[PDB]
Design an enzyme around this catalytic site. Structure first.
Site, PDB file in Angstrom:
ATOM      1  N   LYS A   1      -0.038  55.204  47.178  1.00  0.00           N
ATOM      2  CA  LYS A   1      -1.250  55.260  46.369  1.00  0.00           C
ATOM      3  C   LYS A   1      -1.475  56.664  45.834  1.00  0.00           C
ATOM      4  O   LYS A   1      -1.650  57.648  46.558  1.00  0.00           O
ATOM      5  CB  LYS A   1      -2.462  54.793  47.195  1.00  0.00           C
TER       6      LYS A   1
ATOM      7  N   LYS B   1       0.325  51.649  43.843  1.00  0.00           N
ATOM      8  CA  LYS B   1      -0.809  51.760  42.920  1.00  0.00           C
ATOM      9  C   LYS B   1      -0.957  53.152  42.372  1.00  0.00           C
ATOM     10  O   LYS B   1      -0.872  54.106  43.178  1.00  0.00           O
ATOM     11  CB  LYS B   1      -2.099  51.382  43.667  1.00  0.00           C
TER      12      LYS B   1
HETATM   13  C1  LIG Z   1      -7.989  52.503  46.121  1.00  0.00           C
HETATM   14  C2  LIG Z   1      -8.913  53.651  45.766  1.00  0.00           C
HETATM   15  C3  LIG Z   1      -9.300  53.665  44.302  1.00  0.00           C
HETATM   16  C4  LIG Z   1     -10.021  54.928  43.896  1.00  0.00           C
HETATM   17  O1  LIG Z   1     -11.054  54.832  43.146  1.00  0.00           O
HETATM   18  O2  LIG Z   1      -9.596  56.062  44.287  1.00  0.00           O
HETATM   19  C5  LIG Z   1      -8.608  51.132  46.165  1.00  0.00           C
HETATM   20  C6  LIG Z   1      -8.980  50.423  44.880  1.00  0.00           C
HETATM   21  C7  LIG Z   1      -7.935  50.699  43.808  1.00  0.00           C
HETATM   22  C8  LIG Z   1      -8.171  50.001  42.481  1.00  0.00           C
HETATM   23  C9  LIG Z   1      -8.535  51.090  41.467  1.00  0.00           C
HETATM   24  C10 LIG Z   1      -8.677  50.540  40.062  1.00  0.00           C
HETATM   25  O3  LIG Z   1      -8.680  49.287  39.858  1.00  0.00           O
HETATM   26  O4  LIG Z   1      -8.809  51.391  39.118  1.00  0.00           O
END
Ligand SMILES: *[C@H](CCC(=O)O)CC[C@H](*)CCC(=O)O
Ligand SMILES: *[C@H](CCC(=O)O)CC[C@H](*)CCC(=O)O
Ligand SMILES: *[C@H](CCC(=O)O)CC[C@H](*)CCC(=O)O
Ligand SMILES: *[C@H](CCC(=O)O)CC[C@H](*)CCC(=O)O
Ligand SMILES: [Zn+2]
Ligand SMILES: [Zn+2]
Ligand SMILES: [Zn+2]
Lengths: 340, 340, 146, 340
Positions: free
Chosen positions: C64, C117
């Site tokens: 991530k 992600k």
């Molecule tokens: C991970 C943390 C995201 C953040 O705002 O740092 C959990 C959710 C991720 C999805 C983010 C998106 O859809 O832009």
């Protein structure tokens, strides 16, 4: 009293714990390296030179000899249900047609080229594969042209085979699938297509890992192609021949195959796995052969298994082992089954 | 006239030519990575708690429930023909014996430990393997001890299982084969044998890659072990689960397995191949399951195949795929067949 | 910590409880998105101790990345950091070596599946994951920015 | 009260701890397998046959059609800021110039060869790359010479392409970049350069992994090269075609490529990674295509992203994925940005 002994054990190691991955039916789906879709299915057709033929073979539902005037009624609901591709086998029943060099194999008045034209006309979206071999067309029933001693003439055979394959492509087949197992035939068929300005249009799907064995009984009955004298053990691979299969896979890819078939399927799943490594950049296709198909029917009638259930188990096994395509006599069933 | 077209082709490439390797029956033997010998065969026995039992199951020849006074007449000619090893399954038919924690599993008056003592006495050269699980001994028919919600209690199960396995070894079994598929059970059984000063004497043959599916019908009839409520899908591996099989193989080897079983066999030959890489330093054993065995019989009666022929084809496939051992209900046939 | 930096041990202790508590409530799967060192080990141990590990898929956000593609999500879940940013726990976009190690770590610590992600912008990490984590399901997160 | 539950946890494992590696902005730089430098950037130029042209396209800043009398004012400050290389695309707007075999492609009075001579004269230190294809010069807008049926004529196409590429080299291009995706064209271009005594002077940068898709809109507007009938799906690779990309990479390297381009970039970063293994001994170049470039501009205007920020994120991603060169319409911005 004998009582239930329980040993003292240590805390669970995280490394031991797999169960979180498959405790729910959606996860057991997720665990598949690839899912079973309709467009993966290829259904064999046996075309008769009698245009009104509809002869059932060995009492199996999805092995019939069909003539061209009967094909449109037969394909319409199959294509209706999402059938995307067929693999044609010819069965010339007219006497005097078979000869020692397979002349009728590319007869423009023959059932394969008639079927190709019928299907390109009436089902223009269907993807057409033709089997390329001489066994259905030689008087002796062997896959190639023979020396006077009954052994295979390599050069004469591949010369003949390459013409048949070009001729099917010229007729409108999208794909040729040489099933002859004669040394170097893919090179000669590819060169043939190249010289015919057809190589950029024609998928060559080699039966690269094709094994001799006991599982082709019913097919032989439907395509009437049994060898007359002896057997296929000097060109089809010996079942224990892993090293020869691996080399035949490297060879056929090197010689121009765009895809490969492993046949039979269930009984050679490990060769599929071997193929998924050697031929990792190519589509692998499993051939669920007539012997394997009728074995499942036999087992299901005797109550040993559930036909739909073992059908899904076997066909998922192909995909597990590396195949992304399947030639199967159970395609009509899966076109319904994958709906539910 | 349609005539036989022959394309012009180039000289043969040496790389194309495989045929020199398998043109003679001795070479087709030479091509095997390993040959089928008698001492590779392991024959399952179902021991009844009725000592005079000789009950045939599902009309198959080599699935009978046998009581101990009947075992010597039954094994004598088998051992006569070179049988080297047996795998024992218990079938306690006496009422009130089964309970929720499988107490009878290691009953010293039970058929497994009775059979172990009989065989160590009367056939001291036979290598004895016992299946280790609770499904044949629980009232609910599951392989482990359950939570009140019917799900498997890992820790309670492996604690119980480890005791049963030590207790069989204490009784004289040379090998234990845990078939429960419950997370981390091999670690606890190995630790158990170590603490019992038996780990240097006892081969642990894990059913590491054991799949849920449709092929255990007849076994369930003979060992009377069908689950009462639901199924084995949350501990036996899902058929499409290649990644989970690979991890279960690494796990069980890491936890002390001396050998591994892949089960079923034919339908999971690609996992055998996967196992032959991951577990390359360990013996791999194929289990030709009751469903696979009866499927071949069914097919052979319907005329689809020749029983001896497809038996050799299937069993060579195991060896091709990486197995060097085979548990099979066809062992009596191969003890005759490998003679000729 | 009082200095605004992340308290690893306190964080993973809290996180593991939340994840068990969701499972206890009936979630089939927990997906820890915190990127705090060693949290998967503590969540797995937590589920094991709760007799829930055989029922609960742990889908780690193992690879991530910090970056510019989470704008809209932050608006919808109202979760923007108040002071500073996520650059000391979310992976730096150029950090291939750190991603590879985070993938090996999370699998070793009990992940049943992994999420990469963002997705399109990190397709090469997906490919890296398909090798390291070949025996596990890989999941792509097409993020709100993408 | 609902209160904050904290589970009891074990001491930290060293294996868990990654944070020491990226807690400071200099370390987040250190973590990159390679840094973004000015000399990695290649800027596309669209040369018009109108020498006074300066036409803006699709309202994007760094896509203009420029004529040769306008090039020196345009390049001077770019080269001023460290621009090291350009990739030329021709846009012959004069009527009657385009024809079915792309005759104007190597017109010495054409904008590519005029631009090459201009640049070798006025900017002798600039490294000149020319795109090699026929789509900007055929009346039908396809990348090759066609059969009467509208399909690509391989042999005729590669024969034509090889001449254009030699002719650009003869004119003074340092590098040719064939973007046609027609089977075997790199072999014929390399042989062509060898026969011209130019292979030791000319870098062949193949667009080896070039995908069909939705991201070339704006380019097509600027180079006016859209196909007239149909599309590029039978020569450009299908987006899902990983296996075909891998084979096209091995092929083009085998046929003489000195470097390879993967295109598009962001959307094919995994192919870049695949290329970094197969083509590990060659420079890999990412092409940030016009669709990808305008997508970032669109997103930044709608407030979804910050243009400079997502530009750095995307371009670092190329380098992360294995690229050591970048063709990008954002080169003018990075020549300023990499200063600060
Ligand atoms: C991970 C943390 C995201 C953040 O705002 O740092 C959990 C959710 C991720 C999805 C983010 C998106 O859809 O832009
Ligand atoms: C390969 C040759 C078969 C043979 O009879 O030797 C081409 C057709 C294979 C399908 C066989 C089947 O379905 O049993
Ligand atoms: C594994 C559990 C079998 C089951 O019934 O689930 C131990 C015995 C396997 C042999 C099964 C067979 O022969 O069918
Ligand atoms: C490849 C062919 C492009 C096409 O229009 O099919 C050569 C130029 C690629 C750059 C395309 C872009 O910038 O969008
Ligand atoms: Zn044949
Ligand atoms: Zn059991
Ligand atoms: Zn082009």
């Amino acid at each position: 009293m004998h009582t239930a002994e329980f040993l003292e054990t240590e805390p669970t190691e995280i490394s031991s714990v797999l169960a979180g991955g498959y405790n729910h039916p959606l996860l057991r789906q997720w665990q598949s390296e690839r899912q079973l879709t309709k467009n993966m299915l290829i259904f064999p057709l046996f075309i008769s030179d009698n245009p009104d033929d509809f002869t059932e073979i060995d009492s199996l539902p999805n092995i019939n000899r069909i003539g061209v005037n009967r094909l449109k009624d037969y394909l319409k609901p199959l294509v209706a249900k999402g059938l995307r591709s067929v693999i044609l086998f010819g069965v010339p029943l007219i006497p005097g047609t078979k000869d020692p060099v397979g002349t009728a194999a590319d007869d423009p008045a023959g059932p394969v080229i008639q079927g190709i034209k019928f299907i390109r006309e009436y089902f223009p979206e269907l993807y057409i594969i033709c089997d390329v071999c001489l066994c259905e067309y030689t008087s002796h029933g062997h896959c190639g042209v023979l020396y006077d001693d009954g052994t295979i003439n390599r050069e004469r055979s591949v010369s003949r085979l390459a013409a048949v394959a070009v001729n099917y492509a010229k007729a409108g087949a999208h794909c040729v699938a040489p099933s002859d197992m004669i040394d170097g035939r893919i090179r000669d068929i590819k060169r043939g297509l190249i010289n015919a300005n057809l190589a950029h249009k024609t998928f060559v799907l080699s039966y690269a890992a094709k094994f001799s064995g006991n599982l082709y009984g019913p097919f032989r009955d439907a395509a009437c192609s049994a060898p007359s004298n002896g057997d296929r053990k000097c060109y089809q691979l010996p079942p224990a021949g892993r090293g020869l299969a691996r080399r035949a896979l490297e060879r056929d890819m090197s010689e121009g195959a765009d895809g490969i078939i492993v046949k039979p399927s269930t009984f050679y799943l490990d060769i599929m796995r071997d193929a998924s490594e050697i031929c990792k950049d190519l589509p692998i296709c499993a051939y669920h052969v007539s012997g394997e198909y009728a074995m499942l029917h036999a087992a299901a009638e005797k109550g040993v298994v559930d036909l739909k259930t073992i059908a899904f188990e076997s066909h998922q096994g192909f995909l597990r082992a590396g195949a992304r395509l399947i030639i199967t006599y159970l395609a009509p069933e899966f076109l319904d089954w994958l709906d539910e």
